[PDB]
Amino acid sequence: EKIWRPDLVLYNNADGDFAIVKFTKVLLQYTGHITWTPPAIFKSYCEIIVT
Amino acid sequence: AVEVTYFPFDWQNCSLIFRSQTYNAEEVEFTFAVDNDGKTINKIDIDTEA
Ligand SMILES: *[C@@H]1O[C@H](CO)[C@@H](O[C@@H]2O[C@H](CO)[C@@H](O[C@@H]3O[C@H](CO[C@H]4O[C@H](CO)[C@@H](O)[C@H](O)[C@@H]4O)[C@@H](O)[C@H](O[C@H]4O[C@H](CO)[C@@H](O)[C@H](O)[C@@H]4O)[C@@H]3O)[C@H](O)[C@H]2NC(C)=O)[C@H](O)[C@H]1NC(C)=O
């Protein structure tokens, strides 16, 4: 929460969360490199063919 | 995951996996707690009071 982040969104979200809600800590290296690996539960629309 | 083959006369193997969400093994490590006798409690503890 303390740093700028990309605002990644699941565009084809069905009825769950659109973006990351679990704001876990980021690993910051001395070179300025940041790795952020949040968990999520994605509920995504998928056209189901039942033929 | 439920092994259904002998349901309802079945036995299961359920895992409980604990880890640090933030730190790698070099930064934070784990050891099992020892009992009053100094024996390592490498199992789920069961207190008869609770
Ligand atoms: C309930 O569920 C748990 C978890 O699933 C089971 O415990 C696991 O059981 C499996 C075997 O079924 C164990 O896997 C075996 O581990 C052996 C030891 O190597 C491990 O540990 C060393 C530690 O230094 C590591 O370096 C290594 O990478 C491994 O993690 C291996 O020798 C075994 O190898 C065999 O299988 C592999 C394929 O998986 C083959 O490639 C090999 O040639 C060989 O045939 C195997 O990998 C696993 O470690 C257990 N996890 C634990 C104990 O935490 C319980 O057994 C299960 N209880 C039941 C069913 O009663």
UniProtKB/Swiss-Prot annotation, chain A:
The gene is CHRNA1. It is linked to Multiple pterygium syndrome, lethal type: Multiple pterygia are found infrequently in children with arthrogryposis and in fetuses with fetal akinesia syndrome. In lethal multiple pterygium syndrome there is intrauterine growth retardation, multiple pterygia, and flexion contractures causing severe arthrogryposis and fetal akinesia. Subcutaneous edema can be severe, causing fetal hydrops with cystic hygroma and lung hypoplasia. Oligohydramnios and facial anomalies are frequent. Isoform 1 is only expressed in skeletal muscle. Isoform 2 is constitutively expressed in skeletal muscle, brain, heart, kidney, liver, lung and thymus. Belongs to the ligand-gated ion channel (TC 1.A.9) family. Acetylcholine receptor (TC 1.A.9.1) subfamily. Alpha-1/CHRNA1 sub-subfamily. This is Acetylcholine receptor subunit alpha. The chain holds residues 103 to 153 of 457 of the full protein. It is found in: Postsynaptic cell membrane; Cell membrane.
UniProtKB/Swiss-Prot annotation, chain B:
Coiled coil: none annotated. It is found in: Postsynaptic cell membrane; Cell membrane. Glycans are attached at residue 13. It comes from the Eukaryota. It is linked to The muscle AChR is the major target antigen in the autoimmune disease myasthenia gravis. Myasthenia gravis is characterized by sporadic muscular fatigability and weakness, occurring chiefly in muscles innervated by cranial nerves, and characteristically improved by cholinesterase-inhibiting drugs. Myasthenic syndrome, congenital, 4A, slow-channel: A form of congenital myasthenic syndrome, a group of disorders characterized by failure of neuromuscular transmission, including pre-synaptic, synaptic, and post-synaptic disorders that are not of autoimmune origin. Clinical features are easy fatigability and muscle weakness affecting the axial and limb muscles (with hypotonia in early-onset forms), the ocular muscles (leading to ptosis and ophthalmoplegia), and the facial and bulbar musculature (affecting sucking and swallowing, and leading to dysphonia). Belongs to the ligand-gated ion channel (TC 1.A.9) family. Acetylcholine receptor (TC 1.A.9.1) subfamily. Epsilon/CHRNE sub-subfamily. Pentamer of two alpha chains, and one each of the beta, delta, and gamma (in immature muscle) or epsilon (in mature muscle) chains. The muscle heteropentamer composed of alpha-1, beta-1, delta, epsilon subunits interacts with the alpha-conotoxin ImII. After binding acetylcholine, the AChR responds by an extensive change in conformation that affects all subunits and leads to opening of an ion-conducting channel across the plasma membrane. This is Acetylcholine receptor subunit epsilon.
